[PDB]
RNA sequence: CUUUUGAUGUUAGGGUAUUGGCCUAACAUGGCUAUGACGGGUAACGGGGAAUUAGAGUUCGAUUCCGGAGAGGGAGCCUGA
RNA sequence: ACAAUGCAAGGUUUGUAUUGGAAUGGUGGGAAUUUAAAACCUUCCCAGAGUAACAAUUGGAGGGCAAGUCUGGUGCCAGCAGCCGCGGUAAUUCCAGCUCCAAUAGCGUAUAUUAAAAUUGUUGCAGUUAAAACGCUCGUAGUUGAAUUUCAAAGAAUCAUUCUUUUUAAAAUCCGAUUUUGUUACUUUGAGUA
RNA sequence: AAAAUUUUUUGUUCUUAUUUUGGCUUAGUUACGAUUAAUAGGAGUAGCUUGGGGACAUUCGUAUUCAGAUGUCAGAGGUGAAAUUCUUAGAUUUUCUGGAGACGAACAACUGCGAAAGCAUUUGUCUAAAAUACUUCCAUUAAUCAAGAACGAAAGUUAAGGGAGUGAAGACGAUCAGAUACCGUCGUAAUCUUAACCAUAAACUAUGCCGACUAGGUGUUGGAUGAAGUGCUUCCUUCAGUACCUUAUGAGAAAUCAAAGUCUUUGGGUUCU
RNA sequence: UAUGUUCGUUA
């Protein structure tokens, strides 16, 4: 039964309805309280707005991010 | 895959949401100005979209504004006479020829140069079938080195 | 696909392919080469009239053991020398050394028949009298 | 290169039906394959099919009833006049009592019988039986 | 391949029953071709048709009718609508 | 062709050599007629059939392939045989007789051609090993090429379905109503077809 | 800017102008006007990504051999057994030094890369490719292709260089009835480098390329996602390779084949034979 | 892991 399949999320990309695995998130460095947007699977180096600090190193996937920070999904 | 083997289904899949993301409170009255500034500072549209996605958090320019980036870049007259991929293929062929004029024994480089020149000719035929290239465009292999412009 | 073009505008390719490839079977080539006219002695005729030059006993194949009676015939139409088998038991005696003879094919076109090698023709009548009416019974008049 | 979307659709239908899997997914949907499927439906050979209409020339999921022996495309789409319908039928269809040869005609996709009853033969699409 | 020896076209004329490189003068360099030009072979007059055909096909058509061509081989010409 | 006895089968039925009378052409002669004249055809009158001598042949009998392990002769010879094969003493295959089979006023043979032949394959072949994937890649002609632009509902009629009719955007014609809206392929009808 | 209408100066005829419309330039108004973004393609970006992909330079290793030295003294090589061969002028053997050319073991695999041929010591430079990840760009740019083109083992040819080892030819020694062979000793060309040719191999998975579908398991190579013993290490999912095993109410003449299947229920595209 | 050839034709 392929219409009401529910565990297509674990499926490979371009499943029954193709849908990107990436997303966007906001980052709050503790003691920094900065507001800026970040892309999952980011491809280049990125900096903060309030106080410049390295945030995530671009890798072949979801980046390494930092040892701290509170990062929250931007999904609605 | 045009040459060689390997399907390589790696790609980017757009979301079902064709509209601008709801969480984006930013306005399209200056996204095009941003890409215009990027192009003036000197960036090809392929990487303009990427730096827009990463450093500005505004994915799918087509969703933020109802128009695509090369289209609006043309609408401002910015777009170069030679398109993205044709220019990149020309640059790669030029680099290969420069390597080959020193290493005459690189048979593999010669084979790859033939392949990339074939791709150049196919793409050129397409682009001048569209009005996107003057009808006399030819890609002389002698003059390609400076043709990059 | 099936190894052949199938598109609705591939008729030329199919036609040239068939035209070239039909030269590959023996029958089409044999019946369509211009060689056949100058090759066979009958020049495409079913029968021919010749002059008997000599009579020869021809050895049969290995599995068999016989002396087939044949006649060397000079055709009067072109002058070629052929060898014609003489069917019948005593039919060799019924044909002398300088008679006009009528010959036909041996039934396998230009191929040899039976244990008799290199013979493609058979005598059907000598001195305008049928060998058949001469041998199997003397219903007809004797040799002239 | 897929060339014919309908050929893919029908080969997938036939393979799934041979396995008897009762439900099949055809990825590259099209209006032609939709009309073919609903003509098969009208003739009673498949059940309720449903098109998952995403933004990418969407997919189709059809319910099989174990009710089809062979569905196939005919490539190329030979243009057939009304006169040689019988000549095509006696060679393709397994009997002159059941099975349908699907025609694309100036009046839309239809089987041989109703194309004959409505005149105006057309181009051959495929068959199923 | 064709093009001096008309090949392709323009202009003018001659010629014709009439159009036309049909021919002449000048001029331009054209025209056809792998969708097979130019050649070679045909034991090739073409068609209506014939045989064999389940359907496709394959083979034949000198020969009743139609069209063409010829009167031993070429060429020329009178009369005449 | 037909009728009676013998013989065979069988519950006084069929086939079956003797008889012995009918019928009829082929044939000849005359005529009508036919025909430019004549001939043929058709029709009418005379004779005219019992071994109805008014006498059917051609090619076969190992298999393919219908029909002989019948009798003589020859004896790896002569010969037959499209192919497989037969022939050295028991030859079902040669040469003969008898018988039988086949088609029949027809029956063989040669060559060509069609089907057979899906062994030229569009329908519709094959390509690891039977013949057959170019050493490999690029590549022009050629062949082929993703999805997308206007979708349903209501009624009369056969039996339970099927079948026929109308509208529902927009722009130019008609004072709530009257009317045209790419090109081709393709397909349908025609026209004109000795 | 012109036409249609009218009136009209004016003794066979000479002004003119009036209103409506087809075309030029000018403020504003239209719902003013651009289909997706293909498990098609191409381009891009990213990764203490991958790889025996290629070229050039450079480095190392023993072995073999040459030369020199070294110590000793009768044999040493080689074979089925021998002999040819070397050997008191010291062979073989031991140790050391220097040179030379070739090769690159063991690791090394039903592993990796490459279009195929093919590619394996280090390091550097140059160059290319592929996979993966991508809410990056273009938007049909594609598939297969007669002609044509690039590359194409080995051998072979040409010209320089190189020349250790092996060694088509050749010469011996054997074996044998013979032995021009197989075996042994030697040995020319060749093998290696550079620059040109040649264009062929059982150049083979004897299986053209692209696309779709059809099944389980064991692996393994390269990415990516998620999860956990100790920042480290394993498992899960997934993509792309690459094999193997089982199964076929799939195929086939069978051997066999996950393609050689989805073929008399015969047609996805295409080239060659 | 020394050497060790040949068997007329037909049925």
Nearest to B87 by CA among B147, B30, B134, B42: B147
Closest to D75 in 3D by CA, of C7, B78, B82: C7
Number of other residues whose CB lies within 10 A of the CB of residue A27: 23
Token code pair at residue C43: 């020049």
- The nt closest to B12 (CA vs C1′) is G134
What's the CA–C1' distance between D112 and E16, in Å?
A: 63
Q: Determine the distance in angstroms separating the CA of D54 from the nearest CA of chain A, rounded to an integer.
A: 7
Structure tokens at D36: 């073919």
Alpha-carbon distance B37 to D45, whole Å?
61
Give domain limits for chain C.
Answer: 1-144
Calculate Rg over the CA atoms of chain C. Answer: 22
**Are β-strands D46-52 and C121-126 bridged in parallel, bridged antiparallel, or unpaired?**
unpaired
Residue B16 sits at the chain D interface (C-beta within 8 Å): yes
Residue of D nearest to C8 (CA): D76
Q: Is B110 helix (H, G, I), strand (E, B) or coil?
A: helix
For residues B50 and B44, give the distance between their C-alpha atoms in angstroms, rounded to a whole number: 10
Chain B residues whose CB is inside 8 A of the D27 CB are: none
Q: What is the set of domains in chain D, with CATH numbers?
A: 1-68 (3.30.1370.30), 69-129 (3.30.1490.10)
Q: How far apart are CA D14 and CA D21, in angstroms?
A: 11
Distance, CA of B26 to CA of B24 (rounded, Å):
5
Q: How far apart are CA C124 and CA C130, in angstroms?
A: 6
| Spatial separation of the C-alpha atoms in residues D13 and C52, rounded to whole Å | 77
Identify the helix (H) or strand (E) that includes residue B93: helix B84-100
Assess contact for A53 and A29: CB atoms under 8 A.
Answer: yes
Residue pointed to by tokens 């060998």: C131
Number of structural domains (chain A) is 1
Q: Which residue of C has its CA nearest to D3?
A: C7
Q: Give the residue from A9, A12, A15, A24 with the most B CB atoms within 10 Å of its CB, the best one to mutate.
A: A24
Residue B73, Cα to own-chain centre: how many angstroms? Answer: 13
> Is the bond preceding residue B74 a cis peptide, omega within 30 degrees?
no
Q: Do B14 and D54 touch (CB under 8 A)?
A: no
Nearest-Cα residue of chain A relative to residue D22: A1
What CATH code is carried by the domain that includes residue A43? 2.20.25.100
Chains B and C: 3 or more CB pairs within 8 Å of each other: no
Burial class (CB in 10 A: 0-12, 13-18, 19+), D60: buried
C chain contacts of residue D76, beta-carbon cutoff 8 Å: 6-8
Terminal-to-terminal C-alpha distance of chain C: 72
Alpha helices of chain C — where are they, by DSSP H?
Answer: 11-21, 26-32, 35-39, 131-135
Domain ranges of chain B: 25-79, 80-149
d(CA C114, CA C125): 21
Write the Ramachandran bin of D91: left for phi over 0, alpha for psi from -120 to 50, otherwise beta: alpha
8 Å CB contact of A46 and B23: no
Q: What angle do CA B6, B7, B13 make, to 5 degrees?
A: 140
For residue C102, the SS3 value is strand
**Which residues, 6+ apart, have CB-to-CB distance to D35 below 8 Å?**
D108, D109
Coil, strand or helix at A70? strand
Q: Are D61 and A3 inside 8 Å of each other by CB? A: yes
Q: Which fold has domain B80-149?
A: Helix Hairpins (1.10.287)
Distance CA(C6)–CA(B97), nearest Å, equals: 42
Resolution (A): 2.7
Q: How many CB atoms lie within 10 A of CB C123?
A: 26
C-alpha distances out from residue B107 to B100, B103, B112, B113, Å: 9, 9, 9, 10
Query: How many CB atoms sit inside 10 A of residue D16's CB?
Result: 18
Q: Which residues of C37-54 are buried (b: 16+ CB within 10 A; e: fewer)?
A: eeebbbeeeeebebbbee
């Amino acid at each position: 039964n392929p219409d009401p399949v529910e565990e297509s999320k674990k499926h490979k990309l371009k499943r029954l309805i193709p849908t990107p695995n990436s997303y966007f998130m906001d980052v709050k460095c503790p003691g920094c309280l900065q507001i800026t947007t970040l892309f999952s699977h980011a491809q280049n180096v990125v900096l903060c707005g309030s106080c410049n600090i390295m945030l995530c190193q671009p890798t072949g996937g979801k980046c390494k991010l930092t040892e701290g920070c509170s990062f929250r999904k931007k999904i609605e | 895959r045009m040459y060689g083997k390997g399907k390589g289904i790696s790609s980017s899949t757009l979301p079902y949401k064709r509209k601008q993301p709801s969480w984006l409170k930013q306005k399209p009255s200056e996204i095009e100005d941003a890409i215009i500034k990027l192009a003036k500072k000197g960036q090809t549209p392929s990487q303009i979209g990427a730096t827009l996605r990463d450093n500005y958090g505004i994915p799918q320019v087509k969703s933020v504004t109802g128009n695509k980036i090369l289209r609006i870049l043309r609408a401002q007259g910015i777009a170069t006479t030679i398109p993205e991929d044709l220019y990149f293929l020309i640059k790669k062929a030029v680099s290969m020829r420069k390597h080959l004029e020193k290493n005459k024994k690189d048979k593999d480089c010669k084979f790859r140069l033939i392949l990339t020149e074939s791709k150049i000719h196919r793409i050129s035929r397409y682009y001048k079938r569209k009005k996107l290239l003057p009808s006399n465009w030819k890609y002389q292999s002698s003059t390609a080195s400076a043709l990059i412009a | 696909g099936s190894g052949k073009p199938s598109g609705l505008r591939a008729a030329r390719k199919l036609r040239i392919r068939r035209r070239t490839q039909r030269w590959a079977d023996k029958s089409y080539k044999k019946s369509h080469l211009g060689t056949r006219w100058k090759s066979n002695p009958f020049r495409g005729s079913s029968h021919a009239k010749g002059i008997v030059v000599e009579k020869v006993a021809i050895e049969a194949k290995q599995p068999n053991s016989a002396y087939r009676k044949c006649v060397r015939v000079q055709l009067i139409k072109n002058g070629k020398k052929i060898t014609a088998f003489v069917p019948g038991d005593g039919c060799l005696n019924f044909i002398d050394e300088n008679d006009e003879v009528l010959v036909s094919g041996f039934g396998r076109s230009g191929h040899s028949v039976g244990d008799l090698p290199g013979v493609k023709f058979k005598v059907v009548k000598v001195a305008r009298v049928s060998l058949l009416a001469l041998f199997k019974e003397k219903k007809e008049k004797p040799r002239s | 290169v897929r060339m014919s979307v309908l050929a893919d659709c029908l080969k997938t239908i036939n393979n799934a039906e041979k396995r008897g899997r009762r439900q099949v997914l055809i990825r590259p949907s099209s209006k032609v394959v939709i009309k073919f499927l609903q003509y098969m439906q009208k003739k009673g050979y498949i059940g309720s099919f449903e098109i998952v209409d995403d933004h990418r020339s969407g997919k189709i999921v059809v319910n099989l009833l174990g009710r089809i022996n062979k569905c196939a495309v005919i490539s190329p789409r030979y243009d057939v006049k009304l006169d040689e319908i019988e000549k095509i039928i006696t060679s393709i269809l397994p009997s002159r009592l059941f099975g349908h040869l699907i025609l694309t005609t100036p009046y839309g996709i239809m089987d041989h019988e109703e194309a004959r009853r409505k005149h105006t033969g057309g181009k051959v699409l495929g068959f199923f039986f």
